[PDB]
Amino acid sequence: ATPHINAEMGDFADVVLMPGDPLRAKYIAETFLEDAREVNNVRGMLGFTGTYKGRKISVMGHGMGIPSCSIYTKELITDFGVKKIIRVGSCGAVLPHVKLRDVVIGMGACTDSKVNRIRFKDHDFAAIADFDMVRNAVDAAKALGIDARVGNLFSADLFYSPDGEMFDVMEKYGILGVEMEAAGIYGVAAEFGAKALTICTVSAHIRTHEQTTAAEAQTTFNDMIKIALESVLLGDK
Amino acid sequence: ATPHINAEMGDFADVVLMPGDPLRAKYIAETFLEDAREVNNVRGMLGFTGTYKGRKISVMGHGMGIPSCSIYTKELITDFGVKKIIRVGSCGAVLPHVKLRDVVIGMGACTDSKVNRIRFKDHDFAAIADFDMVRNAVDAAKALGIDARVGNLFSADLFYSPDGEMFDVMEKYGILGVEMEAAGIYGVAAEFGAKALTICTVSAHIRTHEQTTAAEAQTTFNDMIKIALESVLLGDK
Amino acid sequence: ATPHINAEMGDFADVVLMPGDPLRAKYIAETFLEDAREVNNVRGMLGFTGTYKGRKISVMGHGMGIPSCSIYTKELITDFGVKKIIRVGSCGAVLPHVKLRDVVIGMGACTDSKVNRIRFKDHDFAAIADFDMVRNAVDAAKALGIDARVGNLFSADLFYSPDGEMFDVMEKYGILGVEMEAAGIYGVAAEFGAKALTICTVSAHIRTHEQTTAAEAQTTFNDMIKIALESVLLGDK
Amino acid sequence: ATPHINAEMGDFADVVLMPGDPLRAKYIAETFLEDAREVNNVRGMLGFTGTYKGRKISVMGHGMGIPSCSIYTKELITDFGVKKIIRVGSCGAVLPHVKLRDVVIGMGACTDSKVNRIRFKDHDFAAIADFDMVRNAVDAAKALGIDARVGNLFSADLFYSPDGEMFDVMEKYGILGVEMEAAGIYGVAAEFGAKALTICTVSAHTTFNDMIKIALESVLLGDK
Amino acid sequence: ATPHINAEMGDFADVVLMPGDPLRAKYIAETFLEDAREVNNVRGMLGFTGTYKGRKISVMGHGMGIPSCSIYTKELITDFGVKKIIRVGSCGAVLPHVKLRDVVIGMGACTDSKVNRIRFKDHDFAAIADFDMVRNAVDAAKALGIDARVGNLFSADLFYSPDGEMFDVMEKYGILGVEMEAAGIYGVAAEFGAKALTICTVSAHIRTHEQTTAAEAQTTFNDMIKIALESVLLGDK
Amino acid sequence: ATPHINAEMGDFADVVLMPGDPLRAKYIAETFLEDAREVNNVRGMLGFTGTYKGRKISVMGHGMGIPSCSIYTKELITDFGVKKIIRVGSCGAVLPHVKLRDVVIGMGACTDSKVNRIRFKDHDFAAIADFDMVRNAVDAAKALGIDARVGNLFSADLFYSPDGEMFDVMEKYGILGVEMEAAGIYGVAAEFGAKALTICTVSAHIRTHEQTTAAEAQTTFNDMIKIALESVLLGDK
Ligand SMILES: Nc1ncnc2c([C@@H]3O[C@H](CO)[C@@H](O)[C@H]3O)n[nH]c12
Ligand SMILES: Nc1ncnc2c([C@@H]3O[C@H](CO)[C@@H](O)[C@H]3O)n[nH]c12
């Protein structure tokens, strides 16, 4: 019923978890949700709806990059009644003791994209998460006994940057993770009046060159998923 | 001492409340702090240190504008061991449900200043507060029975803007209050590795034209001060 | 292998056709390639290698947006020996005489992305195709009796743009189609020293609602694939 | 009254000298003016009015940075009938043959602020002083046996630069001094149809009293 | 007549060759055109019209820099019925394997000018040549036994640049030649609805600081003019 | 000789007057200079040297636009010992009260060119004249009973600008005349350590104003040149 999602109103829950990888979305649905049913396959960007401890929850890929996730998050918000989006992604670390598989929560997201300047008359829009969603994730992580650091992400347009110097700048300003979506989703949420949060798992260290495998990112970043799901239940009250 | 502060290490607490108005700092010191003493008067930018419920706390003006407060925040952090800065300011509102004297908490701060682009290689730095400090303010406000919205501020360089239409864009994107400092303080905090939070009292409504007096701003915005002070105690645990 | 491609040197031909939709990649492999073998499925971004009239050819999706396709095209070039990339996508028209099903070839690509400014010290980089590839496509098109316009595409970051006025500007400057990838692929081609071409078919007329049948669309899609495939054989000499 | 100035029309002369430091405004008032009276104290930004050689003159601090002085200069111009603003400040010098107690007059003011780009559709606005005021200041200095240097200032947003990249660039293109207000004041003057001048004493690489005399005497030359 | 051209409709052919130096336009007229007559001398910017192999052809200087050539090209288009402009110039090489005397055809033109951003709402306009004119020039060069390079020029505002590093950037993204006009002409052609092409001969290597001799300069210049003229004939078919 | 001036050290005086039109330089030489002779004709950019009231003076065209005049002024300063450049041109007025044939002295020059941002690390360089030169010109005019207007010029890159509304902004900020060179000449003067001034006579009113223009002055084109020449004699004292 939308140009990139073959589904109808009601097919999605009012909260959607979104990794960039549709195969991770499939894994999450098969592993964490009961009675999961596929609700989208357009362009292979798989989305599912099921229950978690009785709560109706959806999970769907958003693809890589600001332009990709801006399409899907917009369509979910304006045409599927989605009120909350929780991005559950991977990121690269620049800080010395942020390590592989650490969970980080993006209360804010820097970017080298032009999308928000386009929205905001070429000034600086502070791309931020919903505060209550941030707090729910923090509280859920505490209850699960999982460490999670809250701060700034950097949403990059170029995974392969010609400007390695920017990584030193990011590190100097305390950037917790480099990914490619948070700032765009946060812009969409502000534009169309919904609520968003990005939680990432560290899948690479940009300095040490340590990194997980594609298979590991697809199916073993479960801490962030437990946090995301439990945080929804806290949100419901 | 530093070029704009004639004091020595120890004269300031590790937390400093900062309004733009040094006369407001003085009122706060005389009204909320016991055994208050003047620790700065360079350029008339009054700063005081005293105790609040046994806790050593400072309050000092930072002047109007990003370049003004950038100077004071830098100097406090590098030379006076300051770890937390709570800006306690005034702001104008654009949103139709935001009222005069409402308290707003700036989890993020947008800006039309160039200073963060200067820091961040001409990219978008998301100028954000420290998460724990935001939560401390929210919890303290709740305990006090004082309402407070958490969200984005906009830090303007021009109080008298030629671009009146930018207010519609701010309103569209949910900006809670227009002030002149938060994004600057947040960038300095990130640069020099400290923590910061801006809490503001709505002193004018840009749509309804309602406005408090200069006298009222100087001495009567006490809800935000109570919140800030109690938030520090929560932060100490 | 790379983080985004689970294959090794040799799995890909030195020419790769890329639609945005990985399911179209599978379609192309099944319909126009002989002895097609799937060589990638990381993140569900299907890629296949086979032969067309004896010539080894690969086809793989690139996802939506400049950041997505920039990852895949970079990795193909630096790690898989890929010499030529031909994007085969869809676009929206703004010109009155450009009709649904028309084939456009992007000799250049305008953009509102910041990726090329990041590469090019904030100056104007003209994102352009390889001339021989453009010529090969024009000649292949002629031999199949298919008309094609050659000129500028516009690669947009925001499918749902808040700036409707920009479409008038694109029309005024002769933009043939609006898509979301070409300028990004062309920047990668220049950065890493390879050759690229984007060919699109018009699937929408922006400022209407007009569409064709799923049949007219498939036939037209097929026409583009044939132009792309025949253009490669011409390039081989 | 305005949100930042507790006074009424007539409380200010039509010319206002403005140092950054309000305590320096007080000093100027007490030292050079007859019958000096405090006319503003909102936010502690002290302003005074009195007479210099029979001529009504006001002096008021403008605070540090473009945003601060933009508020005060605008309000003076639009709400208190002020026609001329003379900033009297300090600056740091980058040029070798520009000396450690020299008086420089900013005929132009560079900046890394975005405020004039906001005013001028993201093009380059040459932030300039009023020419007659520059002339009056040069002649006033000359009559006092001071050769003031006239040229470009640089108005910085960041007193504490993250990288200091601009210092060599300022030296290369002949900037006479570095301060934090001129480009802002000149933008306000252009936007609201008034006249402005910034005069600075090179504080780093009296003197102070000399600069003030120059400013005041330049007003009297302007009156003729 | 127009403010910088004292001539009337008909005085120019529908195609105009344009060197920067008006004295070179005079040489071209005298050397290559039959029955050449001078049709402009305003500001000393000599223009001539005559025939080449029976075909009416004009040649006129455009002066140095984007602002200068933008004036002349605009006026020819809106008031003299000119359809095609061929800039014929010299350029400096940055690439090690681009040699003195090489012929470069600018299918695209990069620039550090702001003129196209002014036209294109501060986004990236890809300043491109007309495709048929590019192909006509390649084919004409081939028939003359010359292999021209086709790619990007860079059009600089500053002949004497203070930013030496930009040349490294140009070299990195494969710029074929540096001159001062192409991007401006391409911008005018798109704005006013005409066709343009820039052909240059490399007369300098920016790194080696080598410089073509006068004898080879005259030779390769003549080759460039032959290519331009014969390309017009090819285009007429 | 320099790449654009076929002359030797000594052929030029240490002060050079520059109109845009080389034929105008010719006119100035013949009308005002004694024993004038041609010192350059490269690209038809005529330069002459002679005496005015015993004072050795030169006059040479600079062509149209910032990039053209930037080339000539640089070379004169670095290779011909030129100390002062006085541009003598025409300009268009945007203020209704400015008169036809009024003389405008550009103490400053705004621009939409990027050349000074390239020099000044993307910040705002105030392109200004030499103060003594400005005063000399003011005094010279006054002596001849002409009240010259002293303030900002605007140096445009596009004589045919697509942004008519920018002229409203110029009027609002008090711009006295629109031309195409001053800001560039001032940038070169500061870059290479020389002194410059632009003097213009108003030759048109730009755009239609409700008001009605003041009137028209009795001042002549020759009057402007005299002011320029006389201003040099004052400078000599
Ligand atoms: N070191 C890194 N840099 C940038 N992005 C990523 C990611 C995420 O994975 C994708 C790119 O691999 C994209 O969606 C991004 O958000 N993981 N590790 C990353
Ligand atoms: N409506 C409004 N707009 C902008 N700033 C302010 C303020 C704050 O007060 C000062 C200007 O009045 C400055 O510090 C700014 O942050 N109060 N009301 C405001």
Ligand SMILES: Nc1ncnc2c([C@@H]3O[C@H](CO)[C@@H](O)[C@H]3O)n[nH]c12
């Ligand atoms: N009218 C339009 N605008 C933008 N993109 C597209 C496309 C292509 O389809 C995808 C988005 O639907 C993306 O890859 C884009 O290049 N088809 N029609 C389009």
Ligand SMILES: Nc1ncnc2c([C@@H]3O[C@H](CO)[C@@H](O)[C@H]3O)n[nH]c12
């Ligand atoms: N070397 C220097 N750099 C920046 N600002 C200043 C000043 C002025 O002093 C204040 C900062 O101390 C501010 O008003 C600025 O304009 N004096 N010397 C300076």
